[PDB]
Amino acid sequence: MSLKSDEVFAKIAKRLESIDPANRQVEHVYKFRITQGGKVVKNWVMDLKNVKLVESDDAAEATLTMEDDIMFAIGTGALPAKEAMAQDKMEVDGQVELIFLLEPFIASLK
Ligand SMILES: CCCCCCCCCCCCCCCC(=O)O
């Protein structure tokens, strides 16, 4: 069945369809890891080109690792991405700015 974190992926993708082609910001290949408790359970890819979010693992310019519990939390902007990671409760690797671009987009989701 469909889980909570699932809605997140759908939200992000649906949000990408908003960004009009007459004015873009920053699009690139991102990586999303869904760890359950401490170990990975699946891979996720951010198709910023086709404007979709599929499940896959590849060498992306920016790697973002987060647990399911955090998927729905951050995805819905329920908790602060800064504080969340500040407590070493999240592992992300990539250009601060790059990840900072999706920060203001988190709210767009519900
Ligand atoms: C900082 C981590 C937050 C992750 C969850 C928020 C993801 C929001 C998705 C927005 C992607 C970037 C869209 C703007 C680029 C463009 O299409 O021109």
CATH of the domain at 59: 3.30.1050.10
Return d(Cα 61, Cα 98) in angstroms, integer: 9
Range of the domain at 70: 1-110
Contact 13, 106 (CB under 8 A): no
Method: NMR
Return d(Cα 32, Cα 103) in angstroms, integer: 15
Contact 10, 53 (CB under 8 A): yes
Between vectors from CA 65 to CA 60 and to CA 68, what angle results, nearest 5°? 130
- Centre of ligand 1 from the C-alpha of residue 48, in Å: 9
Q: Which residues have CB under 8 Å from 9's CB, separation 6+? A: 32, 44, 53, 75
**Tally of structural domains, the chain:** 1
- Pocket lining: 24 vs ligand 1, CB cutoff 6 Å: yes
- Centre of ligand 1 from the C-alpha of residue 73, in Å: 15
Sign of torsion, CA 56 28 110 82? positive
Residue with CA closest to ligand 1 atom 17 = 19
